[PDB]
């Protein structure tokens with residue numbers, strides 16, 4: 001039975017092997033939509049070459065590469081199973097992986113979708129909170145794909161561009177957070193500080209009106225309401241790259257800072273991610289939870305498990321898609337509004353790309 005509804009899952013993607021690091025980094029630092037750099041066409045290759053060695057080592061420390069592909073697949077397949085049941089009219093569904101900087105690229109996925117003769121195409125972002133740097137860049141890629149070849153899509157497009165407070169997403173983090181608290185020494189539980197660690201963004205992106213920080217902050221609130229404020233918490237930011245200013249406080253300074261101030265029991269939460277990858281398995285689990293923790297003398301620092309294979313997360317993706325279809329909306333209302341200080345000509349086009357679809 002021919003596939004009827006295609007769900008394109010969008011994310012950054014990561015290198016599968018050490019041999020894939022360099023090209024991954026080149027594509028990444030060349031992407032003006034992610035972040036701007038002077039003479040980016042020439043600076044990117046320089047950055048890529050210089051950075052490749054230490055990143056390769058980091059990947060070797062966590063198994064030899066990023067597992068983002070396998071988790072995205074496990075989540076997609078689970079979503080499809082529930083969709084075929086939840087929405088019979090939308091015939092069989094099929095998910096497509098659209099990574100921004102590694103195979104399968106966003107462009108390759110779209111081609112396969114067109115090749116499949118689908119009727120419906122849904123750009124489903126895997127970034128729950130929207131940033132023009134993440135979901136925005138991935139969507140711009142879909143627009144430019146058709147714009148370059150200069151042909152109209154052979155399928156109906158629509159997009160779920162964000163879902164920062166979806167109740168099942170909130171329940172997963174809350175569930176994962178409770179299971180972690182249960183593992184601190186009992187007499188230290190009520191003292192544990194919950195640090196929600198979202199990926200940071202350069203202030204050059206934040207100060208243009210990026211929706212990201214506010215949406216992340218929204219995810220944090222919901223989760224803490226569900227936990228009914230059982231513990232104190234803070235929203236900190238990880239993974240800053242380069243010397244320019246980024247949104248702080250940084251997760252590392254925060255962990256170090258709490259530890260030197262009497263708060264030696266910390267629970268980390270990768271609130272802006274959907275699966276394990278370098279940002280969690282290496283940065284949070286090794287760099288901070290092993291090295292930094294040991295040097296500052298932390299008594300207990302743990303991290304809530306990533307959404308990964310949680311059945312409930314799969315239920316969340318399917319429910320979002322089903323509701324999306326039932327609604328007939330082409331995109332969120334927020335997508336119809338670009339950054340007040342947006343200076344990217346493509347944004348206007350991408351926006352129109354989804355708001356233009358008939359049916």
Ligand SMILES: C=CC1=C(C)c2cc3[nH]c(cc4nc(cc5[nH]c(cc1n2)c(C)c5C=C)C(C)=C4CCC(=O)O)c(CCC(=O)O)c3C
Pocket residue numbers: 011012013014015028034035051055065066067068127131133134198199200201202205241272273277278279
């Ligand atoms: C806009 C500024 C950003 C820059 C400059 C950025 C840079 C990177 N992001 C990477 C990987 C990644 N970044 C990722 C999600 C995000 N990355 C984000 C924003 C940025 N990410 C945001 C926001 C994300 C979602 C909350 C993911 C998913 C990986 C994949 C790595 C892996 O192991 O799969 C890597 C490769 C790792 C390294 O340390 O060399 C870089 C350099």
Ligand code: FES
Pocket residue numbers: 132136210337338339342343344347
């Ligand atoms: S950079 Fe945000 S809408 Fe263009």
